[model samples]
Structure formats: C-alpha cells, structure tokens
Target: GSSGSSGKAQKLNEQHQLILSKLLREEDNKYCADCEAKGPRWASWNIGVFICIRCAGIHRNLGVHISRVKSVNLDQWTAEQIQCMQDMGNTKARLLYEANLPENFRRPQTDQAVEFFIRDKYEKKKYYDKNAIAISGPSSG
Candidate 1:
C-alpha cells in the first residue's frame, strides 16, 4: 500500500492471499518451513514467505501504516518542531508538521495554514516518504 511498504501477510485479504499463493508457492521458504518446528518456537505461521528481509520489512511496516490513513489533522506546535525533524532524518515528523501548519506564520491563529505546508508535505511524500513512512497506499484525490 501507500506506506510505500508492501503487502501485509497477517492482514491479507482474499486478493493478497490469492496473489501470494500464486507467487510464493513455488519458492523455497528461507526459514525452512519447519525450521521453527525444531522447538516450541515452531513458527505456527509461515514466514520467510516473503522474498527477502528487506521486502519483508517493507511488508511488516504496514502494520503501523494502516492506522495513519486519511490522517489530515496536524498536531499543535508542529511548525516549530518540524524544522528539527527535517534537520534530522524523520520525514514522518516533517509530514506531521506540514499537515498541522497554520495558514500563515504572520497571521493570528486560525484554521488555515499556508496551503503550501500541506503541499510541501505531499511533495515530500512524493519524493521522500519511504517504505516506512506510516502511510497507507494512495486513494483517489
């Protein structure tokens, strides 16, 4: 989905299940489908079902992603905090900041922030919100 992450096996719908069954049935499970069977730790579930850890990580990241869908409200004091988040590597923080931004830095507090903040946030999403951005897949604008 849009978290820029891939599909979630745990949350698989019929479609994902069908696709996964088709694509992965032929591949050897890296964890040796029964490796976990060696102990009480036996994986009751199948993992290594994904192609690689990186891919799997992308997929699992969606566990956090699904919750953020349609999150348009910005947090308070987000503007000042965002500059530092930008300085650091937290793009999610930046997005949150931009989403919460007020219409104009110069105006009295009100509902609208400069629209550019949201625009910039989306811009960052277009360019930088990566596979772990706590985002769901895009929906129609």
Candidate 2:
C-alpha cells in the first residue's frame, strides 16, 4: 500500500496569495480581462490575465489547452505560476491578445456576447496581431 505521507507538495502560503491580490491593485488588472467588469477575483494563470467569475467560467470551458483558470483567493499557487502573472498582467496580455481588436468592436456585455468574444480572442486568436513583434524587449536574433 502507498503511504499517505510519502510526498509533500508545497502548498501556497499567505504571501503567495497576497502577491496575487497585490497584482489586482494595478489599474489594468482591476477589471475583467474579457468583459471589463469591475473587481475581478478570478484569473487565468497560464494566459496571465485577471478576469471576472463569468469570464473565468468561459475560459475554463475553453479547456486548459487554451486557458487555465483559477480563483485568486481560493486556489493554491506555485512560485512559477505567480511569476507568470507578474510578468504579464492584464495590460500586457491585452496588448498581445487584443492588438488588432477593431476600433468599432464594442466590449461585450451579455453572457452570449462574452462567450463569443472570449472564444474569438483566445481560441481563434482573432484579434491578435501576428506581425507585431513582442513588446517586452528586443531579441538579438
């Protein structure tokens, strides 16, 4: 029989969770990455963007292959995961994901509209700028 205490996975501490809360203080992260709703408590760690619960649900439905959603307050986090969020908050992620969002495109309000926008933004990469180089830094190559 396998022992119960064989492996001890390091769980996130208060500091880790607090770090996430701090990220929300950023002006861009204060709103949902998808719907622009206020006070987003959920986040897509892999995509490195904060979002509201409604949008988070849609992201979950998109499957982990596209987005990985987590409750900022309830979920346990790893150091690398926190680092990912730090490196790309809502603003930076939007630049990458919504670079080509048409000026006429209105922010979605209804549930159906939100779902469609989320799908188009992440799954299809519809608004992503394919030609724009990464804005973080210049590459030597």
Candidate 3:
C-alpha cells in the first residue's frame, strides 16, 4: 500500500524545481538560446534549451508540436523534462541548431527581429546542418 501519497508527490515536484534552479547556475545556461538575454527564466523542454520571456512567448506561437514551453520558476517539471535540460543546455543547442549559420548573420536584439530569427532557427531550420556532404562516386572505376 502507498504510504505518503499526494504529499510525497508534491515534495518531489518541489525538489525537481530546485534541481532546475541549480541547472541555471551553469555558465552555458546563463543566457537565452535565442536572443542571448541574461537570466532566462523560461525553457523549451522538447528543444532542451533555456530562453528569455520574450522568446518564450514567441515559442508559444510556434505551438506545442514544435516547442513545449515552460517556466523554470513557476511551472512544474517532470523528470524527463529536467533530464532534457541537463543533456542539452544552451551550448549544445547552439551547436545543433545553429551549426551552419552564415558568417554575416547578426544576433537579433529587438523583439520583432527576435521573432523572425527564432522562427527561422526552429521552424524553418535554416541554419541546422543536415550533414549532407557530397561524396564522389566510387572513383569511377
């Protein structure tokens, strides 16, 4: 039979929040993945990246299918969600999503430009490298 039940569940959830808080202390996680804003309080769990409030709002418009947004402070996090954050964080996400950005690409600073960049980065995947290296055919033997 269950001993503690709901109370235990609540405690575990709070602990999870604390874990997420600790994660924010990491240097790689200090800034927003999209706009490089300081102290991002929101996260896209599925994308495994921390983001700022403005970017998070834009992420919502992208829909849950693409990005599942949540508050690192206000929202409850499940174990898997926390794990995703641990595994990816901002540094790794930049490598994965912005692998092939152009040399002259400018980091978006304004709200309107930020939305445009985020949509292109995630939805259109304009910068993500597909590793489509060209290989010559079998030495033409």
Candidate 4:
C-alpha cells in the first residue's frame, strides 16, 4: 500500500543526484569563473547532470559500449568524491584556461571563458552584465 506521493518523492530526490559526485557545501564557494551555485557541475565526455556515484554508474554509458572505468555507485560514493569532481572541473577551467573552447567543443568549466568573452563582445551588455557603473578604473577587461 504505497501512496502516489512516494513515486513523486523518489523522482524529486533523483533530481538532486550528482552525475560524477557532489556534497553539500556549508557555504557556496567560488565555482566556475562566474561562480555558479553550489551544485554538481557534471560536464563529462558523456554525462551531463547532477548524480551520485550510483547515478553516474547508471549513466556512465549514456552513449558507450564495452564499459569504460568502473562507474562508482551513488550509494558507495564518498563525500570527497563528490567535492573532488567539482574542484577538478573548476581547476580545469581556471588554472588551465580551458574555457576557450566553443560550445560544440566545450568541456567542464569552459563556461567561465564564455562569460568573459561575451562580456567583452558588447560594451552595453558588459556594462549592465557586470554592473560596471563605478567611479574609476583605467580600463575594463
């Protein structure tokens, strides 16, 4: 005797699942170059979404065969794994300046460059987008 609410609850919880891995951050730290919220930032070669190691295991083959790395199950995922994935993605973008890739060729964290690039593309857009109505600065870029 299960209520319909159970199904919905299950589905809703699934929505928060991390793709690679994720953990709850006590405070939202700097994410991406523009600082996205404290959430799973899955941008893998195949997967794209929030899911725990288990969810990632299920989704490891969104479009694959012969099974690659043994996908970690969300059930067995550690907090470190979740946080590490996000950190890795951010590092790839910021330290390596990997955000230069175009949308078609984009990978994790590349969204960082897009924001900077887009801001540079238009003056008015940049002004409002960055809230640059300040007093002084030799240049903006």
Highest-lDDT candidate:
2
Off by over 4 Å in 1: 1-113, 126-128, 133-141
lDDT per residue for candidate 4 within 64-114, as digits (tens), equals 542122333423444444554465443433323323334584323454554
Off by over 4 Å in 2: 1-14, 132-141
Give the alpha carbon lDDT tens digit for every residue of 105-124 in model 1: 33212214323322233333
Better of 1 and 2 by TM-score: 2
Q: Model 3, residue 34: displacement in angstroms?
A: 1.2
RMSD of candidate 4 to the true fold?
15.0
| Model 3 lDDT, residue 40, Cα | 89
Global lDDT scores for all candidate models: 0.29, 0.83, 0.80, 0.35
Weakest lDDT window of 10 consecutive positions for candidate 2: 6-15
Candidate 4, which ten residues in sequence have the lowest lDDT sum? Answer: 43-52
Q: After superposition, how far is residue 19 of candidate 4 from its true place, in Å?
A: 16
Q: Clash number for every model?
A: 8, 0, 0, 14
Top-down TM-score ranking: 2, 3, 4, 1
Q: Which candidate number maximizes TM-score?
A: 2
